Amino acid sequence: ALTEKTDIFESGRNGNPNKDGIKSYRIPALLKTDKGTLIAGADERRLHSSDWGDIGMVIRRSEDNGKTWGDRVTITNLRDNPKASDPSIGSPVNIDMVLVQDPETKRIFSIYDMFPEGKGIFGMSSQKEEAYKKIDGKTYQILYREGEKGAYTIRENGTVYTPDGKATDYRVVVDPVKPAYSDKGDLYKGDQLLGNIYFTTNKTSPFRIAKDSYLWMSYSDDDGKTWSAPQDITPMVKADWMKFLGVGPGTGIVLRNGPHKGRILIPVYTTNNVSHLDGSQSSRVIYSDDHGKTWHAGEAVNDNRQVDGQKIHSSTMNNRRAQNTESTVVQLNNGDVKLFMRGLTGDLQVATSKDGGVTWEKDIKRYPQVKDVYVQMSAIHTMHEGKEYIILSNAGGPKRENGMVHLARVEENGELTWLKHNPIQKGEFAYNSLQELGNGEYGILYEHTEKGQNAYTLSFRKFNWEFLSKN
Amino acid sequence: ALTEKTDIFESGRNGNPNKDGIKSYRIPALLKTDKGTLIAGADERRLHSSDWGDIGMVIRRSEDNGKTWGDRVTITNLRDNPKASDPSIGSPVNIDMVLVQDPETKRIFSIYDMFPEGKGIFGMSSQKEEAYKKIDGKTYQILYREGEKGAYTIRENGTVYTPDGKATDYRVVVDPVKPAYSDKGDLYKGDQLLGNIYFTTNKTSPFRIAKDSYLWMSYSDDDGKTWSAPQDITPMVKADWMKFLGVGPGTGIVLRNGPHKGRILIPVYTTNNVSHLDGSQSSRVIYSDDHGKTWHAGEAVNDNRQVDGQKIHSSTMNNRRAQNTESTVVQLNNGDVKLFMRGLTGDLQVATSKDGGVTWEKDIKRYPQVKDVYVQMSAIHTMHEGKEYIILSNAGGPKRENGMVHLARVEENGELTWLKHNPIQKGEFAYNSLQELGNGEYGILYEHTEKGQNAYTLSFRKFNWEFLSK
Ligand SMILES: CC(=O)N[C@H]1[C@H]([C@H](O)[C@H](O)CO)O[C@@](O)(C(=O)O)C[C@@H]1O
Ligand SMILES: CC(=O)N[C@H]1[C@H]([C@H](O)[C@H](O)CO)O[C@@](O)(C(=O)O)C[C@@H]1O
Ligand SMILES: [Cl-]
Ligand SMILES: [Cl-]
């Protein structure tokens, strides 16, 4: 009814790197594909456990439902700045992934954050730098040149254009060829490699992108075996007011019923320039109705939300306790969308959308039955049998420790009743990603440490319904 | 060389309404049309001199170079909330205009601010309310209903649609017909008038627009005698981050030379939600390249500007001294665009655009030869002999007093060499608008009070080259 842990991504120990040179793994995502393959995603955090540095977006695959796992496949790994004074912050950053498969096209998506070199979400410029320019319908990423105010642009074939629209002899690698696409952003003057547009210190080229928060996507048309080059989806979904825009890591969904069936939903969250991480973190979804081709932002749960008798908006709020951050998303059988959101109330908060995640109902339902120590969670829809349920897993607390699996009945109303709450990992426990495996079995990939392991080792267990019923 | 003043818009005296029941006139705009006509526009501030209340946008015409003047024509006057507890704040507000004529189509444009009922720029809601929604390629204005979270929309024919897209029995007057378009925004159910979508207190109807800052445009195709209904240009130019977006009052320009010849430029300024009016006021222009049909926002002077060693952006800045607000715009013969901006440095701040006002060069030039007491100004291009010059008019100081006309020579590289500084009005002097008349003589419509007049009475004077040259 509950297996022993199988370590999928093993961290080093006692502050040293592991055999592969990697100190740390974080941020699990678990996906069961149509071929019944399991894909386990993670941040490969080479130098340290923090939310920056040299981080690879990696997966392993299991073709026997979680028993054995293949070699690490690197989706994206941007090259470090070799001239960086501090290598700990000396790399363009990718962090936090969401996995989802399109049930129709079979195409698998990994959506993840990107930052240029520096400290990620803790190292964003205090003043806005414009990141994109629309020139005659077409949107181009801007480049800033050493000692100049104007916006250069990256146009077709990566040709750098001057602020007043003349081709230069500078080229950006927009179609990277190297393993894990480490050549992405490389800046050339004709045939000479000069540097990289994602480097921000001790640069050997004239050009850098805006110091901002970006959102990238890579896909696989062969069950996770190979991956496309990164697609920059930021300009489709990020408004000019948004400071940070990033994924709520884990596994996204495709809507299975209602008038929006087929819609891909990816949890994200933003901050604003009024209060940033202190009081503006706000959950929402981005979505696609054309099988991952184009993406749109839905509204935030916090948009026109009533809080302490006054209305807030995600773009302007400064309310620590009204924040909702990383979230996990589930569609019910009655068409509704539930968003379970990390937050600061000490218990679970849940928003409901009736239009397929575009807008959210007036009230956030809180559930004191499920604690929330302010850490990521995952939740999936399950049938048993045929009564409707939701499985949710997160830290039991008091801190990031004692991993719990929670079971709720979904009432024919759309309401939820919490029934059973079962420990699944004693000791350290943080992020996790649940999946349905079939025949009453469920998989979980999660963050844990023991015997001096660096934060974190990512381990996998299976369980069945009998595990869930314990009281 | 300098005529005595002709009062064009007369304010009340001693805190009382004038003979028309108007306490105050503010915010001159002066427009010399193709026909020779002078159009003097103003805020007609009925109840008090403050930046809110019951205000009409009004003009008077002169066909004899300012000697005689016709009757006031009211461009727009939104009706007051008849149920407001405090009438001094109980009206939807129009405030601050910019006039300009298209030299090709001859169309005259009045661009001005609009707020729903309340205290204008001084009563803006702390949190964002989204004002517009795009649905299937179309942008619709949003309505909010008491007790509901979702966005109603004003669609085709003014029919109100529910958050989820059904027609209701409600409709808005989107094509107003009453004098001064005082019916604009009226909320009907069937043929029963219920209230107004611009009303924000003691409402008799279920619906209101977002409490935000809007930009409206009305146009004349008959030398300013009659005017179109207001056109809401906000969604074309206002980004989601902007809090306030409003005009820099006076008279805008059409570019006469260079790659962008024919571009209509209108000075505006924004605030942001980080620091609002304390640290974010930022000049820029909006513009039209198709004769005022569609409008675009240029970048702010403050966008990627270096201030005390550090880059700022108009959307994120919190810097009182690096603010720039109302401005006046001039195109030089070499094609450069100069923007003279009201600021907090004591002297004249000037920005330069090399691309027809879309982006601005890295330095703001300060000219200590011209004092700025933090008050609006106007400035125009003029050819004499013909050498290229700029005339700028504002207050000399130390307060809003002693009006000046300034002459600068514009050098081939666009640098300004200030030649002459001649006083034009003793005591009270605030906003003003300059025009070229022809000989050349030069007109100035300005704010000034004497003899217990309420702020302000708006008076007109002519002056010629030899007055400037003193
Ligand atoms: C992009 C990014 O930084 N993601 C990280 C977030 C954010 O820092 C917080 O959500 C900010 O509130 O949280 C973690 O630090 C955490 O709680 O373990 C890890 C995660 O990778
Ligand atoms: C829309 C509006 O309120 N306009 C008004 C401005 C602004 O309040 C300030 O520029 C804000 O900083 O200032 C005046 O009061 C002024 O200085 O005489 C008059 C003007 O009509
Ligand atoms: Cl570089
Ligand atoms: Cl009403």
Three-state DSSP string of chain B: CECCCEEEECCCECCCCCCCCCCEEEEEEEEECCCCCEEEEEEEECCCCCCCCCEEEEEEEECCCCCCCCCCEEEECCCCCCCCCCHHHCCCEEEEEEEEECCCCCCEEEEEEEECCCCHHHCCCCCCCCCEEEECCEEEEEEEECCCCCCEEECHHHEEECCCCCEEEEEECCCCCCHHHCCCCEEEECCEEEEECCCCCCCCCCEECCCCCEEEEEEECCCCCCCCCCEECHHHHCCCCCCCEEECCEECEECCCCCCCCCEEEEEEECCCCCHHHHCCEEEEEEECCCCCCCEECCCCCCCEEECCEEECCCCCCCHHHCCCCEEEEECCCCCEEEEECCCCCEEEEEEECCCCCCCCCCCEEEEEEECCCCCCEEEEEEECCEEEEEEEEECCCCCEEEEEEEEEECCCCCEEEEEEEEEEEEECCCEEEEECCCCEEEEEEEECCCCECCCEEEEEEEEHHHHCC
Backbone angles phi, psi at A122, to 5 degrees: -100, 10
The answer to whether B92 touches B116, Cβ cutoff 8 Å, is yes
**Among A185, A182, A232, CA closest to A209:** A185
Say how far apart CA B429 and CA B403 lie, in whole Å. 5
Ligand 1 binding site (Cβ under 6 Å of any ligand atom): A 27, 51, 95-96, 113, 120-121, 246, 277, 281, 325-326
What class, spelled out in words, does domain A1-130+211-471 have in CATH? mainly beta
- For this experimental structure, what is the resolution in angstroms? 2.0
Within 10 A of B332 (CB to CB), how many other CB atoms are there?
20
Q: Pick the closest to residue A119 from A52, A202, A215 (CA basis).
A: A52
Measure CA A180 to chain center: 18
Backbone phi, psi, residue A194, to 5°: -105, -40
Task: Report in angstroms the alpha-carbon separations of A417 from A371, A385, A402, A407, B426.
Answer: 14, 16, 22, 8, 78
Structure tokens at A133: 């320019």
* Cβ B224 vs Cβ B37: under 8 Å: yes
CB B196 within 8 A of CB B209: no
Which residues place a Cβ less than 5 A from the ion ligand 4? Answer: B 195, 199, 203-205
Q: Which residues does B395 contact at the CB level (< 8 Å), separation at least 6?
A: B371, B373, B375, B401, B402, B403, B404, B429, B430
Distance of CA B86 to the CA centre of its chain: 26
> So where are chain B's domains?
1-130+211-470, 131-210
Among the listed residues B62, B114, B106, the one whose alpha carbon sits nearest the alpha carbon of residue B229: B114
Strand pairing report for B38-45 and B24-32: antiparallel
- A370 backbone dihedrals φ, ψ, rounded to 5°: -115, 115
Q: Which CATH architecture has domain B1-130+211-470?
A: 6 Propeller (2.120)
Q: How many residues does chain A have?
A: 471
CA atoms of B19 and A352, how far apart (whole Å): 60
Q: For residues A61 and A75, is the Cβ–Cβ distance under 8 A?
A: no
Residue A210 to residue A117: CA distance in whole angstroms: 11
**Candidates A44, A51, A327: which one to mutate for ligand 1, based on the most atoms within 8 Å of Cβ?**
A51
Cβ count near B415 (within 10 Å): 13
How many Å apart are CA B322 and CA B70, to the nearest integer?
Answer: 42
Query: Which of B129, B164, B240 comes nearest A240 by C-beta?
Result: B240
Residues of B designated as active site:
51, 326
Q: Which neighbouring-strand residues pair with B255? A: none
Phi, psi of A287 (to 5 degrees): -150, 160
Q: B195-205 as b/e, with b when 16 or more CB fall inside 10 Å?
A: bbbbbbeebeb
Q: What is the spatial distance between Cα B175 and Cα B187, in angstroms, rounded to a whole number? A: 12
**Radius of gyration from C-alpha coordinates of chain B:** 22
Query: Burial, B451: exposed, middle or buried (Cβ in 10 Å; 0-12, 13-18, 19+)?
Result: exposed
Fold of B131-210: Intramolecular trans-sialidase; domain 3 (2.40.220)
**Rounded Cα–Cα distance for residues B143 and A157 (Å):** 45
Q: Is A428 helix (H, G, I), strand (E, B) or coil?
A: strand
Q: Cα(A343)–Cα(A365) distance, rounded to whole angstroms?
A: 13
Measure CA B338 to chain center. Answer: 18
Ligand at shortest distance from the CA of A95: 1
User: How far is the C-alpha of A251 from the C-alpha of A267, rounded, in Å?
Assistant: 9
Q: Judge contact between A27 and A95, C-beta under 8 A.
A: yes
Q: Are strands A167-172 and A159-161 parallel, antiparallel or unpaired?
A: antiparallel
A405: which 2 tokens? Answer: 């699996």
Q: Is the dihedral of CA B423, B426, B430, B432 positive or negative?
A: negative
Record the tokens describing residue A60, joined without a space.
């392993």
Q: Does B317 touch chain A (CB under 8 A)?
A: yes
Radius of gyration of chain A (CA): 22
> Which tokens belong to A241?
């007011």
Q: Which two tokens stand for residue B228?
A: 């179109």
How was this structure determined? It was done by X-ray
Beta-sheet strand order (sheet of B108-115): B231-232, B214-220, B108-115, B93-101, B250-251
Q: Give the per-residue SS3 of A245-267.
A: EEECCEECEECCCCCCCCCEEEE
Tallying the residues shown for chain B, one arrives at 470
Which secondary-structure segment (H or E) carries A50?
Answer: none
The distance of A306 to chain B (nearest Cα, Å) reads 9
- CA A401, A405, A406, A407: dihedral to nearest 10 degrees? 180
Distance of alpha carbon A119 from alpha carbon B64, whole angstroms: 68
**Tell me, what amino acid is at B197?**
I
Taking the C-alpha atoms of residue B231 and residue B219, their distance in angstroms, rounded to an integer, is 9
Rounded-to-integer distance, Cα B130 and Cα B241, Å: 11
- Give the sign of the dihedral formed by CA B397, CA B400, CA B402, CA B405: positive
Contact assessment for residue B338 and residue B352, using Cβ atoms and an 8 Å cutoff: yes
CA angle A113, A282, A382 (to 5 degrees): 80
